Structure formats: C-alpha cells, structure tokens
Design a binder for this molecule. Structure first.
Ligand SMILES: *[C@@H](N)[C@@H]1CCCN1C(=O)[C@@H]1C[C@H](n2cc(CNC(=O)OC(C)(C)C)nn2)CN1C(=O)CCCc1ccccc1
Length: 710
C-alpha cells in the first residue's frame, strides 16, 4: 500500500533544553520558522507524498461529487432588524462565502448588501465581525485574508451601500461597538511589530489596546481609551449599554469564562471621548464572568458563573454595588446550564439552556425573572438568534444531526405568542427517516458518566462490523451539541458508517465543573473519557478497533493525537485537524499564551510535570508489543493558521515519521497536508471545505479499505 518514501528531515541533535532538571531534545525546532527555505522545502516534500496518496483511489472523487451535490442547498441566517431595515445572510448553496442581503420590510424585495465573494478569486477573503451603528444607517465590518485572525475594518453607509474611506488596520480579537451618538466606534488593535502580520508569522500578540475611531477621520487620529501596559496579556473589549449611556469594558486574561468589568458613564465625561475614559472598576478581579444582558437605569442584569457553575442571572445596581446587595433574578439550575440570554421587546428575556446536551428556549419577564413561555423545539441545538431590546420580534435557528435547519419567527407584540416556521430547507438524498440518533451515558475510568450521541442507520446489527467516526474536543468550556453535517452523513450513507460524538470533560456541557474536570492537572480525564467512548463503541458492537476513526480539531487535534500515542491499539485511523501538539512551547506563539488557563504553562515545574505526560510531540513511542503499530494518521493544517501555528503539526509529523514511520512493523501511513491561503478554519471558502472533507474521507476509505455504497 505504501509506495512512497518519507522525506529525509534533518535532526538538530544539539537542540536540548532543561525544563526544571528534565532534559528535552527538540531536533525539529527549526520547523518553528515558517519563512525559512528549510521549512518551505519540508512542507513541499510532505505535500508531495500526501496528495497522490489521497487522490489515488476513485473514492475521493465519488465522495467529492456526492458532497458537492448534497451540500448544495440554500443556507440562511436569521433575519435581524437594524434601524428601518432587515438583514440576513444567505448562500444559494455552493457560494464560497455567504452574502449579506438587505430588505426594507419582511415582505419586500431583497437586494445584495455585502458580497464577500467579489473580494477574491478563490473566496479567501471573508467577513470576520461586524457592527451596525445604533440607528442602522452605518455599518462596520472586518475582513480577513487567507483565514488569518488579522482583520481590516472597513465602513459603509447603509443607504445605497456606499463605501466610505475609513480603514482600520492591526485589528485582531477585537470588539466593534458604536457610540449611540453615531460619532464613532470602539475597536481593538495591537501595536506595530517587526516582521509580517499576515497570518504566516508566529509572533506573540501582547499589549492589545482599546481605541475609538471617529467616522470620517484617519486611523492615526483614533483616541486611546484603555490600555494595560503592566499586564501585557489583558484584552479589554467594549460594548455600549442598551440605552447608550455606559461603555462596559470586559477585560479578559486567558480563556477562562471570567472577566473584570469596568464601566464609563459617558454623560460623566468632561468633554466627550477625548482620551483615557473615567473607568469605574465595578468588578476588578478575574473571579467570575459578568456578561451584560440589559439595564434599566443603574440596575444592570448580567449572566454570571460567580459561585454558580451552571450560570445564573443577577442584577447589580451601580448605585449599591456591594455583592451582598445583588439580586438573583434567575437562580442557577441544579444541572441545566444557562448558555446565553438576550433581552428583547424592552422587558422580555430569552434564555437558552443546555439540558443533557440539547437546547431549550424560554421567554422570561425582566422584572421578576419568572418563566412566561417555552418555545418548543425538537432535540438539537439553537445555533442562531436575533432580537434586541428595542426590537419586537425574535428569530432563532434550530439544527440537529439529521436536519439542516429551521428558522422560527415570533412576533412578541402579540398577546398570545405563536412562534412559526419562517424558513426551512430539506436536503434530498439524505432521508432522515432512514437514521436514528441515540444518546447514551457511558462510565469513564473514574466512574463518571459521560454523554455520547450515536447516529446510525436504523436496524443495524451490533456485530462490530461497521466503520465508525468518533469525534471529540474536550476543553475551553465548549459544548459539542448536535449539528447538521452533510460530510459526516455521507460517511453514514455512502460508507456504511456510524457517527459518534463524545461529550468528554473539559467542555461546557455540565457547566464550569465539567470544564474544570478536563483542565490543568486533570487534563488526562479528557483522554481517558475519549478512550472510554471508543471502548464503549467496540464493546457494544458498533465497531471494531481496525474500523474506528477518531477526529478532532485544535484542542480536539491534541485530543486525538494524544489518544494515538496512549492507545494505538484502539484506533485504525486518526485525523487531527489544526492540532496543538507541542505542549511545552504552545504559549510562545501568537495567542497561545491565552490557553494556559486550560493547559498550564511549562514555565512551572508542577505544570511541566502534567504537560510532559501527554504532550503529543513528546510521547511518540513505538508500541512495545510486536503485533501493535500506530494507527493510520493524517494531520491537516494550513500556512496562515495563526491561531494554532502550523509548526505544531510540522514538528509532530517529522517525529511520527522518524520514530514510528521508520520501523519495519509500521505499515499504516503517517501523513500531513498543509493547505495554502487558509488558516485555522473560520471563513474557509466552500470550495476548500469540500476539498478538505474529501481528503479526510478518502484517507479513511483507503486506510480501512471501505467500499463506496452508491
Ligand atoms: C483551538 N481549540 C485553539 C487551541 C486551543 C485553544 N484554542 C482556541 O481557539 C481558544 C479557545 C476558545 N475557542 C475555541 C474554539 C474552537 N471552536 C471549535 O472548534 O468548535 C466547533 C465549532 C468546531 C465544535 N474557538 N475559540 C477561544 N480560543 C482563543 O484562542 C481565542 C483567542 C482570542 C481571545 C479571546 C478572549 C480571551 C482570550 C483570547
């Protein structure tokens, strides 16, 4: 099967670092330089073996054809009103980028407002963030190129879709918040740095500042409103209160759901926004999250996890701000996580809960917190919403494993509420009645019950004969909830597979306690949980190790890579997308310093001792047993992934190929593909998405020798 040779890759045997008395050799450290001829040549040599391997068998083209056909369905966002007009996103089916439309009424003719497709030949310029002025007459939007986190902000006048001269550079991880006087907008920027800032660099991002841009001026005139020069990792994002009176500053340091919350009463500024604002440091620590919902005068409603790991709503009165005085508007639930909250039609709240990994949606009274109405939903996720305080209606979008999506609408001016289907699309070719979704709870090593969704064809025999695709993430308070994936349903229908999603610890599925169960000293719980999900699928007869593929991205790429090292006997195939692989060095690059809240940092002996045990780069080892080799492995990354710098995958693949790939018993391939004009994934154009899933499933099909089922 392996009619190629791995490229020769220089080992710098002098690259040795002492970590608290533990010597670590890093012979591929040179791959950390993305601009070197050595690194470029490495990437070319790797792509030269991977691409023909993936393209060789007709199955890739069969998959690509079916993906192109089945993914070709109309895709809408929720409608949202801004000022006098309605907006929505829409993709006719296979456009590289969805397009923003505008209409003067719900019943009126729609026209194109912003079409990112016309900004590049290949769909590699994408919208990344936007904000309308409070009156809806002006529009700011971020553009990213080739999938980088870097943003350029541009501006338009809404009436006539007129491009304006204003351009803001050096924007990354930024807020966008207009003052209600319409004069200008808050945003974030980084100071100038040596080298490139295009997404190919690895330079750490520090000293983010908060600026205010006056519309009709040059960026060089922008006002500095907040900075933290003694705290280079702090990031202060601004929003205006719903009445326009207060700027709320949420300061973050790291990825934990916590923030400082300062405010500026804009009426108290001596002469408008002229410099550093008169911040009042309401919550001046990182002990809890305070997410603004709405205010009525000085009474501010926040969603919080302060002493409430499943989240709750509190009211803080700025005129009586001591914690003993806060009112608990909607108390914490014993098990269900309050995921997000919105205020609509002045005095309603819309609360979205997660109940055993499925969403529910409720309308409550702002004054008392009392439940008023349950919006009925099938089992799945709410993935879109609109309805702000001054608006009188809501839209929300529902999705599930088997359903592409339904957008509902509810007119909240009516005495009796009747939510109605507003938009629905059906994908022909995937008959949902042929399949089922089950949720089970399996015990992990330590006895904790972990949820898992399993999607499969109705009536299958549990005889271990089916290929399986088991997905996980496990970190950062991210909940892995049901979603419609044509790419995975093709695996089910056309490759006879079983899909599984394990809700392992580190995620947000059971609130902050679930997240803390998968971080820092307890990160190994993630891996144990995931290995146990695989063991369940095998024991219960869904699959067998040789037919099992595991997949994850980013922190989920770390997940599957670590699992490959720890239990190579459990998996036939491993696809790690944009994975964090070097756990000793991740904090040195771009925004990686922010991840130490989930991982720790190797500068601490205590943390090093956790990290060294599971770091994928540092745990590649030939299996002791003669009959065990590594699973087939494919790493996918891209040359502008400035979220997870691609050196992680480059150094990992070099290590896998040298330590394991050179062994006579290893016959499963260990490959990397590095894409061009792409990044971590957000904003990836449709064409590239289709190529990527075609690569993934062709790899699975060839390695496992799975026949296509037309
Ligand atoms: C990928 N997981 C990378 C590497 C490890 C952490 N990480 C982040 O991007 C990190 C965690 C938060 N995050 C996770 C994701 C992943 N989403 C996802 O893949 O889920 C599916 C939809 C596929 C199921 N996206 N964001 C935030 N993130 C950051 O690094 C944010 C940087 C900016 C920032 C913002 C606020 C505070 C600090 C830093």
């Amino acid at each position: 099967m392996l009619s190629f040779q791995y490229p020769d890759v220089y080992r710098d045997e002098t690259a040795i670092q002492d970590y608290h008395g533990h010597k670590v050799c890093d012979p591929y450290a040179w791959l950390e330089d993305p601009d070197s001829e050595q690194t470029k040549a490495f990437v070319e040599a790797q792509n030269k073996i991977t691409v023909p391997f993936l393209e060789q068998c007709p199955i890739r083209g069969l998959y690509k054809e079916r993906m192109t056909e089945l993914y070709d369905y109309p895709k809408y966002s929720c409608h949202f009103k801004k000022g006098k007009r309605y907006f929505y996103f829409y993709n006719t089916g296979l456009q590289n980028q969805r397009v923003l439309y505008v209409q003067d009424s719900l019943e009126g003719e729609a026209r194109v407002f912003l079409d990112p497709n016309i900004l590049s030949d290949d769909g590699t310029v994408a919208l990344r963030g936007y904000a309308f002025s409070e009156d809806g007459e002006y529009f700011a939007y971020g553009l990213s190129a080739s999938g980088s986190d870097w943003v350029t902000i541009k501006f338009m006048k809404v009436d006539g879709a007129k491009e304006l001269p204003d351009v803001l550079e050096r924007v990354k991880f930024s807020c966008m918040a207009w003052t209600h006087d319409g004069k200008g907008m808050f945003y974030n920027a980084y100071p100038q740095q040596d080298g490139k800032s295009d997404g190919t660099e690895t330079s750490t991002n520090l000293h983010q500042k908060l600026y205010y841009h006056v519309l009709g001026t040059d960026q060089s005139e922008d006002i500095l409103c907040a900075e933290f020069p003694d705290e280079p990792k702090w990031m202060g994002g601004a929003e205006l209160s719903d009445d326009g009176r207060y700027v709320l500053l949420s300061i973050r340091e790291g990825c934990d759901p916590v923030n400082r919350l300062w405010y500026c009463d804009l009426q108290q500024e001596s002469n408008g926004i002229t410099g550093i604002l008169k911040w009042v440091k309401l919550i001046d620590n990182f002990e809890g999250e305070y997410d603004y919902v709405t205010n009525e005068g000085t009474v501010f409603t926040f969603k919080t996890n302060r002493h409430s790991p499943n989240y709750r709503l509190i009211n803080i009165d700025f005129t009586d701000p001591e914690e003993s005085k806060w009112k608990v508007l909607v108390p914490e639930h014993e098990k269900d996580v309050l995921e997000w909250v919105a205020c609509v039609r002045s005095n309603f709240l819309v609360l979205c809960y997660l109940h055993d990994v499925k969403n529910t949606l409720q309308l409550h009274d702002l004054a008392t917190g009392a439940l008023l109405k349950i919006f009925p939903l099938e089992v799945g996720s709410v993935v879109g919403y609109s309805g702000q305080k001054k608006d009188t209606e809501i839209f929300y979008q529902f999705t599930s494993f088997l359903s592409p999506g339904i957008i509902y609408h509810c007119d909240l001016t009516k005495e009796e509420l009747e939510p109605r289907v507003f938009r629905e699309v059906t994908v022909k070719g995937i008959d949902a009645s042929d399949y089922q979704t089950v949720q089970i709870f399996y015990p992990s090593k330590d006895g904790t019950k972990i949820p898992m969704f399993i999607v499969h064809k109705k009536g299958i025999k549990l005889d271990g004969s089916h290929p399986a695709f088991l997905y996980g993430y496990g970190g950062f308070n991210i909940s892995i909830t049901p979603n419609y994936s044509v790419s995975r349903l093709i695996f089910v229908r056309h490759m006879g597979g079983v899909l599984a999603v394990a809700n392992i610890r580190g995620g947000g599925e059971y609130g902050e306690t679930w997240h803390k169960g998968g971080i820092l000293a307890n990160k190994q719980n993630c891996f144990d949980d995931f290995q146990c999900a695989a063991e369940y699928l095998i024991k219960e007869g869904y699959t067998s190790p040789k037919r099992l593929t595991i997949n994850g991205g980013s922190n989920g790429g770390l997940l599957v890579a670590t699992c490959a090292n720890q239990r190579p006997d459990l998996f036939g195939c491993v696809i790690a997308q944009v994975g964090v692989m070097d756990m000793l060095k991740f904090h040195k690059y771009t925004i990686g310093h922010a991840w130490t809240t989930d991982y720790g940092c190797s500068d601490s002996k205590q943390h090093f001792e956790w990290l060294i045990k599971y770091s994928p780069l540092h745990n590649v080892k030939l299996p002791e047993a003669d009959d065990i080799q590594y699973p087939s492995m494919l790493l996918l990354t891209a040359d502008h992934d400035d979220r997870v710098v691609p050196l992680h995958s480059l150094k990992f693949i070099a290590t896998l190929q040298y330590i394991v790939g050179r062994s006579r018993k290893q016959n499963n391939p260990l490959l990397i593909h590095v894409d061009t004009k792409a990044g971590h994934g957000a904003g990836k154009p449709t064409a590239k998405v289709i190529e990527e899933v075609s690569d993934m499933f062709a790899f699975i099909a060839r390695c496992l020798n799975i026949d296509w089922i037309p």
